[PDB]
């Protein structure tokens, strides 16, 4: 369920799900480094009927995981709304910007 | 027989197209693939390391790439660069150092552009704070960081001025930058609000005329920026949609999703039915051909799941690209005619460009 | 919720295997994929730049990679290196500089090995002149080239000695190298001719026992090298083939194409029918299981188009690999039993290896 | 075809055919560098029925061409017959060893 692109919290993921890459939805695979920045999505939880802010931090400093590629775009906006935008590398400010995978971190209610 | 190197591309420049292959599955080995659009022949390639961007010099003589290196790829010191490559030999000539904040992201045209006069490369930075970087081609140097563009995104050159360009800002307006002959900002101006960021966001890809640009919105509206004068005049919306189109929820979708045929004013747009929140990057069900003077559609054709396009004015051509395959269309008449498809041009490309012939 | 790093591999060492993905279509982004063989779960990966090679330290604590960098990938100064990575954190720890002639080629086990005592990494150089490179693990240093191995290829460690190995030479014999405590050559010896290079060339992949090694040939013969003593004694051929086999032109084919189950003396070999010149790298139609004592086949099973294998002596397992998918077999009995297949373990891999368990 | 792996001259190619990569069987694609060294094949000419020596020099210093991958092994031998061997990168001694494509250079009669 969590490893599917249609899992509710992955509604604005453009990348590889870290849970398919030796990590989990909220932990980086071994040897990959969290990004301090992210794009944000607002995703509806069909199970409890509420909407949540999700922060799509990347894991960085390893080459592409290649598993569970997703490209979902709910509420995603272009780069003039920069932190709502998912066509950029959220590893861009890391010590090593190589993109490994994307996490879906629950922040709270929207 | 004796094996030799040092050879030039086998087809004339006017036949060449550049398919920017991100190779997202192995993004550290992105590259540009060079094809002959007349026959589908692969002509050569330029390696572009991690998430490269590419453009061809306006004079047709050089290829410019933008990329990121690290000393040990996944560790060590970062070097963001522009490289200058010979267009005919496909060889590396010069590295231009950038600050370590060049945009890493998908290959929208507007992230890596040049002034109309070809003397300056104009590129998007994100640290993640945004600014526009200026590279002086003759000097081989990064010469200006346009911090006035903070909170803005992408570069739309003005084809009627030598060193002017616009960017789309968070206020829903456009910032115009006019560079001096030294590449430093000589003047700037800000338009009134063109579009509501919240209520009718635009795609960043311009349908660019000589003295104006059109933009399409997430909901199928059209906005325009007229830069015939020093101050940009903005207007819109008009709708791409008639009542029947609205009933089936047609909306635009794609990446480099529009184009303009300047002689006719026809605007080309990738569209799909059943639009709703989250479908703005969907492949094209159709290409619509819009008369921008009458603000009405003139034709519609199958979209072939295309995501990005580009237009050649002088040969009246449109290329479309579905991520892997390039379709070549004749647009000399209102209904485009498919001439051929180049299969397997890329693994993961969202951008194709013609070799310039206009000088 | 808060995103964290710094985590260890989620499955224990004894569950892990290493699939060396050359990614030939994008060979500058080769990598090691770490999998759990018990359930097929992807556990992590180690990036290895251009045409990486990989092995795990004998003690199970570290992953060693070998690769080539250039300052600007396709231009600039070359750096050939060994890297030491922590096995549980999958993080980089140390770069050891090599001379710029480490072998660039497909991932045969014998190109990147270690001594039985784990104190030296032993690798193939080609400039294109060949030599064997020695890395002192404790010092993190390159020692010096074993120039005596010129005109030879690949490294077969001797599991009965702490710092000795053999290599196969163009004369059809084996050169044995015995290192001193500093990793320099202390002594050497050259066997008589084992095989005719012209008439019966062998595959380099050893079926390696504790004091002997067996090799298969292009025409399905078996040759043996016994290193129970200081001087290697060579023999063969004996044929893998019976009359029926010969009638259907069965020959070996693959890359890392053989394996030895040491406790039973069973040798595993990928085979295919209709052999002729040019079929030596063909995928397996079958795996044959040979009793090396009785010199007779004791089982044959479908090959699943496998090209490479590896054996775990400690769990009585064989893995096979078809380039993309890994098959897990129980080999505790003469007939192997297929346990599962891991689909999409790699795009272009010719080498899989277990995380070491035990082995002292 | 010359772009097919079954073309007679390609009998010991392990690589991408340069003729599919913007070069020819005897010229490197633009901006790729010939290797001074090579593996050699002896290939049978189906027209005149004679065997010819083919020198498989690589073109080097650009990333993998990716087109017309072939893996043919006529008369190919392991690394202990080093110059008959095709599981090594014949770009290995070039200024930049990145492998681009393989050429099939006709030397003469075997």
């Amino acid at each position: 369920e969590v490893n599917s692109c249609d899992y509710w919290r992955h509604c604005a993921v453009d990348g590889f799900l870290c849970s398919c890459c030796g990590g989990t939805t909220t932990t980086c695979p071994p040897g990959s480094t969290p990004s301090p920045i992210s794009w944000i999505g607002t995703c509806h939880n069909p199970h409890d009927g509420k909407d949540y802010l999700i922060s799509y931090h990347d894991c960085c400093g390893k080459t592409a995981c290649g598993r569970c590629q997703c490209n979902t775009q709910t509420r995603e906006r272009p780069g003039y709304e920069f932190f709502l935008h998912n066509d950029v590398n959220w590893c861009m400010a890391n010590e090593n910007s190589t993109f490994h995978c994307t996490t879906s971190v629950l922040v709270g209610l929207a | 027989e004796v094996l030799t190197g040092g050879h030039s591309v086998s087809a004339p420049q006017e036949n060449r197209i550049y398919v920017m292959d991100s190779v997202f599955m192995h993004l550290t080995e992105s590259r540009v693939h060079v094809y002959d659009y007349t026959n589908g022949k692969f002509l050569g390639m330029v390696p572009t390391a991690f998430n490269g961007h590419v453009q061809v010099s306006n004079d047709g003589k050089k290829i410019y790439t933008m990329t990121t290196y690290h000393e040990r790829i996944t560790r060590g010191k970062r070097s963001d660069v522009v490289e200058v490559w010979d267009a005919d030999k496909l060889t590396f000539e010069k590295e231009i150092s950038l600050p370590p904040k060049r945009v890493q992201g998908l290959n929208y045209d507007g992230l890596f552009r040049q002034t109309t006069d070809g003397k300056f490369i104009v590129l998007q930075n994100a640290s993640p704070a945004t600014s526009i970087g200026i590279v002086d081609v003759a000097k081989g140097d990064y010469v200006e960081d346009v911090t006035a563009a903070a909170g803005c995104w992408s570069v739309i050159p003005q084809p009627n001025r030598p060193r002017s360009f616009m960017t789309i800002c968070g206020d829903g307006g456009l910032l115009t930058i006019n560079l001096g002959e030294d590449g430093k900002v000589a003047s700037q101006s800000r338009s009134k609000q063109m579009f509501s960021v919240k209520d009718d966001p635009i795609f960043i890809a311009p349908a660019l005329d000589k003295d104006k640009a059109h933009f399409v919105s997430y909901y199928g509206n059209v906005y325009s920026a007229d830069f015939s004068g020093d101050e940009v005049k903005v207007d819109g919306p008009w709708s791409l949609l008639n009542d029947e189109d609205k009933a089936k929820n047609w909306v635009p979708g794609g990446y480099n999703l529009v184009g303009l045929h300047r002689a006719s004013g026809r605007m080309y747009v990738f569209m799909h039915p059943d639009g709703k929140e989250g479908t703005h990057k969907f492949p094209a069900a159709e290409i619509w051909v819009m008369d921008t003077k009458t603000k009405q559609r003139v034709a519609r054709i199958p979209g072939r799941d295309a995501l990005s396009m580009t237009i050649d004015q002088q040969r009246n051509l449109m290329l479309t690209l579905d991520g892997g395959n390039v379709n070549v269309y004749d647009i000399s008449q209102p209904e485009p005619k498919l001439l051929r498809t180049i299969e397997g041009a890329a693994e993961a490309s969202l951008q194709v460009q013609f070799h310039p012939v206009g000088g």
Side-chain angles (χ1 to χ4, degrees), chain A residues 81-102:
Chain A
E81 300 181 68
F82 200 53
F83 295 97
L84 295 188
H85 185 227
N86 73 13
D87 299 337
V88 296
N89 181 18
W90 288 112
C91 292
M92 65 182 88
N94 270 241
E95 182 183 0
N96 190 268
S97 54
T98 307
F99 172 75
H100 185 57
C101 64
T102 308

Side-chain angles (χ1 to χ4, degrees), chain B residues 15-88:
Chain B
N15 287 11
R16 306 183 201 165
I17 67 172
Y18 297 87
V19 182
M20 180 62 239
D21 195 352
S22 74
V23 195
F24 193 80
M25 289 287 289
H26 299 291
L27 184 58
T28 66
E29 208 190 271
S30 70
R31 74 274 293 286
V32 188
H33 293 334
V34 187
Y35 275 92
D36 186 323
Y37 75 81
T38 70
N39 63 12
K41 184 175 174 184
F42 183 91
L43 299 174
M45 53 174 272
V46 178
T48 59
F50 182 77
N51 180 42
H53 288 237
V54 66
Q55 58 189 137
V56 185
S57 65
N58 283 346
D59 70 10
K61 297 185 179 290
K62 304 294 172 187
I63 295 162
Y64 305 140
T65 69
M66 177 171 69
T67 190
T68 295
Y69 298 97
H70 298 261
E71 297 173 301
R72 293 280 188 270
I73 309 165
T74 44
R75 63 185 172 86
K77 180 176 191 50
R78 179 163 169 177
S79 297
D80 287 357
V81 304
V82 164
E83 301 185 350
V84 181
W85 288 66
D86 188 69
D88 291 346

Side-chain angles (χ1 to χ4, degrees), chain A residues 15-90:
Chain A
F16 304 112
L17 302 177
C18 289
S19 60
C20 296
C21 296
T24 69
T25 80
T26 62
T27 60
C28 286
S32 66
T33 302
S35 67
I37 52 177
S38 63
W39 61 95
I40 305 303
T42 295
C43 302
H44 183 69
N45 182 346
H47 306 89
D48 73 1
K50 299 166 181 197
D51 305 304
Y52 293 88
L53 291 163
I54 309 299
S55 187
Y56 297 107
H57 296 265
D58 291 334
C59 298
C60 311
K62 277 190 171 175
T63 46
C65 167
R67 289 138 174 82
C68 298
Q69 193 177 167
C70 301
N71 187 33
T72 310
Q73 300 291 154
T74 298
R75 283 177 278 282
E76 189 277 354
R77 296 295 181 269
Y80 54 80
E81 300 181 68
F82 200 53
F83 295 97
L84 295 188
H85 185 227
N86 73 13
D87 299 337
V88 296
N89 181 18
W90 288 112

